[PDB]
Design an enzyme around this catalytic site. Sequence first.
Site, PDB file in Angstrom:
ATOM      1  N   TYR A 191       0.978  -1.139   0.043  1.00  0.00           N
ATOM      2  CA  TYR A 191      -0.037   0.014   0.069  1.00  0.00           C
ATOM      3  C   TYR A 191       1.012   1.193   0.094  1.00  0.00           C
ATOM      4  CZ  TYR A 191       0.996   1.090   5.052  1.00  0.00           C
ATOM      5  OH  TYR A 191       1.777   1.483   6.016  1.00  0.00           O
ATOM      6  N   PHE A 222       2.535   9.969   2.675  1.00  0.00           N
ATOM      7  CA  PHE A 222       3.218   9.820   4.141  1.00  0.00           C
ATOM      8  C   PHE A 222       3.737   8.545   4.215  1.00  0.00           C
ATOM      9  CE2 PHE A 222      -0.347   7.268   5.962  1.00  0.00           C
ATOM     10  CZ  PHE A 222      -1.389   7.779   5.213  1.00  0.00           C
ATOM     11  N   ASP A 223       3.009   7.611   3.857  1.00  0.00           N
ATOM     12  CA  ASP A 223       3.550   5.963   4.046  1.00  0.00           C
ATOM     13  C   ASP A 223       3.400   5.430   2.717  1.00  0.00           C
ATOM     14  OD1 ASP A 223       4.351   3.479   5.091  1.00  0.00           O
ATOM     15  OD2 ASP A 223       2.964   3.312   6.577  1.00  0.00           O
ATOM     16  N   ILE A 258      -6.533  -0.002  11.300  1.00  0.00           N
ATOM     17  CA  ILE A 258      -7.633   0.902  11.666  1.00  0.00           C
ATOM     18  C   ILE A 258      -8.647   0.198  10.977  1.00  0.00           C
ATOM     19  CG2 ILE A 258      -8.623   3.386  11.227  1.00  0.00           C
ATOM     20  CD1 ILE A 258      -5.319   2.738   9.827  1.00  0.00           C
ATOM     21  N   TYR A 283      -8.319   7.789  11.666  1.00  0.00           N
ATOM     22  CA  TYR A 283      -7.736   8.115  13.061  1.00  0.00           C
ATOM     23  C   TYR A 283      -8.717   9.116  13.921  1.00  0.00           C
ATOM     24  CZ  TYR A 283      -3.323   5.712  12.828  1.00  0.00           C
ATOM     25  OH  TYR A 283      -2.461   4.504  12.727  1.00  0.00           O
ATOM     26  N   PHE A 285      -6.072   5.790   0.488  1.00  0.00           N
ATOM     27  CA  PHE A 285      -4.775   4.589   0.450  1.00  0.00           C
ATOM     28  C   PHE A 285      -5.067   4.007  -1.130  1.00  0.00           C
ATOM     29  CE2 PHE A 285      -2.930   4.395   4.480  1.00  0.00           C
ATOM     30  CZ  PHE A 285      -3.767   4.922   5.227  1.00  0.00           C
TER      31      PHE A 285
END
Lengths: 107, 375, 820, 387
Positions: free
Chosen positions: A26, A36-37, A56, A82, A99
Amino acid sequence: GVQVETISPGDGRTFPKRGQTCVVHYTGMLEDGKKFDSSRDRNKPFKFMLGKQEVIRGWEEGVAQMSVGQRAKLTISPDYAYGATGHPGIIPPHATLVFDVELLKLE
Amino acid sequence: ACFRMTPLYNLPTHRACNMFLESYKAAWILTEDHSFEDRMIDDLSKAGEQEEEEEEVEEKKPDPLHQLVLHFSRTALTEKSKLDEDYLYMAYADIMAKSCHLEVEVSFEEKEMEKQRLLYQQSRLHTRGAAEMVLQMISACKGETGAMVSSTLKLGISILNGGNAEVQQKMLDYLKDKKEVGFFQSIQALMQTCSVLDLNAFERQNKAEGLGMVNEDGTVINRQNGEKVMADDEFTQDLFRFLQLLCEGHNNDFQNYLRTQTGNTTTINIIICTVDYLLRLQESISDFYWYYSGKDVIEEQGKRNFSKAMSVAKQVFNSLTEYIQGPCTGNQQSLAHSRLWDAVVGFLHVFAHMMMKLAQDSSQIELLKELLDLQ
Amino acid sequence: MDILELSERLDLQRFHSHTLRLYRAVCALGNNRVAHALCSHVDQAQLLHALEDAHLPGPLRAGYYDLLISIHLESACRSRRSMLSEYIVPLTPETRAITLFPPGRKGGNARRHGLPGVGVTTSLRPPHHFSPPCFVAALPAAGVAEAPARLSPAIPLEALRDKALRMLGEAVRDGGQHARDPVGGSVEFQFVPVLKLVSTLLVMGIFGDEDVKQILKMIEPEVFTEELEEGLLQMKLPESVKLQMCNLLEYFCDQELQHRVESLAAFAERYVDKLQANQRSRYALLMRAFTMSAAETARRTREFRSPPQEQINMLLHFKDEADEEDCPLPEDIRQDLQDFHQDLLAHCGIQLEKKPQSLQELVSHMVVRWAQEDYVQSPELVRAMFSLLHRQYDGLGELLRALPRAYTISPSSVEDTMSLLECLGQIRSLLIVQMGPQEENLMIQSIGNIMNNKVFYQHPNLMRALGMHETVMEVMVNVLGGGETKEIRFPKMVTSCCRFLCYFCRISRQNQRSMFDHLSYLLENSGIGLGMQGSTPLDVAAASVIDNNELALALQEQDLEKVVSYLAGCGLQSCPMLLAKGYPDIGWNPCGGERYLDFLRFAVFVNGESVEENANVVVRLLIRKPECFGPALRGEGGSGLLAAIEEAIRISEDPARDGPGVPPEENRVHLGHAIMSFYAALIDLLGRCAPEMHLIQAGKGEALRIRAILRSLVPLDDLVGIISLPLQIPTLGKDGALVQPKMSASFVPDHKASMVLFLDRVYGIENQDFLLHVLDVGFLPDMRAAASLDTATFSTTEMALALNRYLCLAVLPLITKCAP
Amino acid sequence: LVYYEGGAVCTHARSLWRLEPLRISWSGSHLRWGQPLRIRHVTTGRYLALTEDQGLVVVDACKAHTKATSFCFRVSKEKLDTAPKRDVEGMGPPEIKYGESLCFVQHVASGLWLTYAAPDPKALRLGVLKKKAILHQEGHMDDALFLTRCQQEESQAARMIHSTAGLYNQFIKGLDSFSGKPRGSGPPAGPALPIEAVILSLQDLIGYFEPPSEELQHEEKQSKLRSLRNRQSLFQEEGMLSLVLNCIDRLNVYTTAAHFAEYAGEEAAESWKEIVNLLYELLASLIRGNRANCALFSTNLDWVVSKLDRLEASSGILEVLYCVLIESPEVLNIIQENHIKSIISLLDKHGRNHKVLDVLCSLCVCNGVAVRSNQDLITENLLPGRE
């Protein structure tokens, strides 16, 4: 909530089964598109087991409907994400998240 | 506890390994030592293949010894609230001192060759400024007793050994051109820190020996700790021998500087400070004299205690003798108005009473000889 | 916009470099959560590619290299470096396999020294611990500061090692090339990050042994060849590069010294096995040969009569050769141990081709050659090179310094010992950080783990070497230093720090001495620490002195000065938090004075035995301090001690004179009970300070004089009144339920026993009729009370039990002495 | 009131005193036993004298009457005072020794012996080591006064500090004078501000505070920084830090140059920018490198924080904050999230600045210890947005 869309089709005959670990790749970027990731940047696919809620729980369900070998575009609302507290540092508070999920295999 | 004493075969293996490690470190490695420090200093001193450059000579590049010296001076002169201990300066200063001193029908020629050798080793050091930074170390030490000041005073002792007039000269100039009180303030604080015999400490030691409590591990009778009495006596010896060697050669200018520091804003008389310390020495000696005067005979540990004390007193007396010698008339007057006369009176009364006490016993004759030398 | 383009824009270059340094600063000191946050902003693969690229500007590459090293390694780096000093070797068979010199056809001393960094080192080092960076993980439902601190983000260490090796080779090659353009724009800019990476990886030890061999070849090829690339020293480098490759040599030498230590450990294992076998044989001969000869048997038994450590010691007394024949060990075993000693000397180089062939000598030559080429202008560099030079010159000295730090552990408890080392690593970790609540929970539970460890019970000398107690008092005083008086920050910290150190007091007498060394400065801090709940730094200091007469003798009069000054200060006014509690004010502080007093009483009585010198000093301080005598028995304007006791009982009767009334902790105590607790403590000191029946029968004049001053200060009739004071007894009521007052208000048999102890210590027993009247005023009312105490319900009551206690401890010895 | 006090005050300038003879000619001559002498305190600039109401106190020179102000120094307590010494021109005979002789201090008109007031009851409860100087006919045993040599640059500093304090007090008085009333379209109606005077004073202060060049060798560099420590300590005890801060506040009540002019006028306005900038520069120079200097700023950090947002001397205030943070850890402990957010807001509004970035880096870690809370807060409030 959770919005799902497919960029590449999957087999469709095989589905994630609740209680089975899934290895996935991902990339996580904000709504504005800033990444960010990225599991690909990690070079190893992220592994999670369905129903453990380590992911999550909003993101966890959005994986479930997605078939194996199917490239996804997933959007998470802050309530599913979140949320108001958010993630200190990485995710701003009460912001939606996007995502793309690659379900390579389930172990 | 001896039937309970476990033979080393019954002893636990790991525990036995540990105690053997301690035993071996005590018995072998601590005992053996070889002086590689001489060649260390030699190598750090020698200069090689600089001359082909031919411009460094006009710049006077520092030899590796001189570089280490300059860096130590950099550390010392740099201002800090507390004189921080450096194990490197610890060991390095010990190395320079031991290399510098590097030490019966000797010919004159032979004795003078030893003297010239000592002059050469002191030369290779004082070319660096070692005693200059020694004074700097004292100034930065600010009269705080510690291994740092002890070792560096010992190194100064080594460089001054034999009273090198050149070293005395350079340190005199350095004290003059700094004209700074802090070094002498350090000196005063230090000789304040110098200990004298304490009756309470001696009776605490007497309790220790008499009790001889069994250490819980097996049976350990008559355990002896480091004698609290004169714990710093060696450092006191070093300091007074340092002042001795500074004043050596009957250098009247140096004795005048010791008596009075005109360049300093505040002037201190280290000689009268020495007189005061001598007075405390007499008070301690007289209290111990009374204590053993109550007893019929001085016990052996007491004999050793007085012995080390009067060795300290011997060095102190030698230092005072060096100060007065030359003779420096200002020092003469300073002693004259001082109380060292009352000091001599107290010492004489102590001397007489110890002679009457010692004279009876045969074992006491060695301490009696040392007392004769002190007198 | 391309990073390479930013090289031309100096403003952007400077801003981005300071940005990198800002990430570095915010991540500093192992801020793991911050580090993960940066991993969100900075990609690991991005950092790797940045390392690979050479065109990127030098300040930028320095910044990114620092960020990689720190944001990922620096926590493990500081931990590993901290535990590098300690040298602990298990007794593994693998450990036994280790030898100082590699096997070969040539003699070991003549054999080449083993290639440094190569071999097996069994020194117990905890594994590095990392957490994978993942943000899809659910938010922790547990509250902050309760969850364990996040681990540092994980990096593929093998791949990182291979790339570090790769650009290391590239740097060496380019240095050989002398290309006009260095990587990053400068030679130092090119090399420095590479040496930083190499340093960190080598110190972690992840750098595999073959790769360490490779690194050695790059440093000095001709040297480290084992039976053209130029040496890094041959290349010549700027001063900073010299600094860090000197650090690399320092690491290599440290590893070499560690290898020496483990080698002596393995030889020690073999030797102790030989000693056990041979000395079993010796003892078997002893039971056999004791029938023939007695004089030799007497000495040989005396050798066995010796404690086992001293037995090892005079066994080891073969070095001098003067008494080697006296040692029971045979000449053969003495010969192989001498061979070991020669081997150790040769490895140290102590015993007696231009290229040195030895790492120490080549390092010495490099230092000398640098100082010869030029004067070093970086004082830190000078310090480093001269330290390294001295160290290479004194390997025997390194071994002297490290041997006390060395220790051996049985293989069985290796895992528990490893757990303990991990705990101590956590403790040292928190020292650098400023104290925060998460850290509070952290070291509280870590200390708890330390107590839970059985190895922590087993090797007291080993802990003493490791120094966790030193680190604990350090963190204690770091917490204390900041505004302790205005606010006792974290009584949980202070109480936990006691529990550990206080337990250490309970552990060992050698440990007692160890902390006794710090007792003065501990007391200085403890001057306010006692006000903290229950166990205090004053309490740990008290636990230190007790159980050693030598410690009691070593007690310092100036320390007593500070303590008695503290005691007088308590008498000067009450504590302010009492008013902050709403507790009504009193002219003096009883509780703190009581804690000081009980400290002094633990000081005076070791094994229940008074230190007469200490008693004399405390007497001096008391006579200097009327406040030490306290408000009661002041003298002029002096309330009687009896009258003060009844007034205190009246106050305890009084509601809200001891309470604000506007107890979650219930620690609040009636002021009457507290002041009389202080006074019973004072009486306890005063009775223990009394001289002893011996040297009273001989009657040392100063002893009887002090005793007379005691009897003058404390009237016998006053004490008779005090013992005459009745004590409330719990009684059945309100259908017969027992009525028990609260002890924080109650006037206690503990105090009454303090009185009685003072009586028997000082006044004692003189007359039979005097004894009878003392009994009928105080002891016989108590003894009718005790008769009443013998009841089934009463037998349950802890208070009647306490009556039985203090009566038996006191009234029974009173009967013993008074029976004639 | 002057009290006999011991401690750091002894090193301080307030303990330093200035002594001058009565006769102008050959004032620098050897001081003579029993010479008529006048005592003025160096920092105050006021004279020591006798007042009937207050005994002896330090009095202003204008109030000084030169006879009650006149005092004489005596080697002897017992008094004959029969024949006055003949005045001598030239260097004169040397009577008293600098740091050697012990002397009694006497008032020629009073004849009263100066002594301590003796320890008062309940004063030990305060714990003050300072006891009022009193004039006693009998005096006391310790009336003999020992004397010490002052140090040249210290005395120079004290003199310049006194002049600086006087001029700045007058300048502040002028500010308060026109502060009350907006001048509007009229004359300022107040005495002219010493504008050029304060510019010159600030410039000299920077020059005389300017830190040594790093190229200087280690030993003289250390000596000069030691002089810097002594100098900063002297200005700290004197109170120049506080009074200059009051100056900054008073000029800060005015927002812009023209707005300040509306109270003062353009002829005062034009310099105002340079005045405030160079003033902030003075604060930075004085506080830089001094633990004691940074200690007071810890009491009111928010005071700095509010001025950080101000525009006219943004660079100067930033440097001031830099020196405060890099030198003191306690300031780092006490900072709060609102303050960090304000700093980030400054970064926004003034754009990218490596200097602001470095100040924030210092805000992260200090003295080898990092504030967990500070690092977490800055990460939380700055990092996620990434704009």
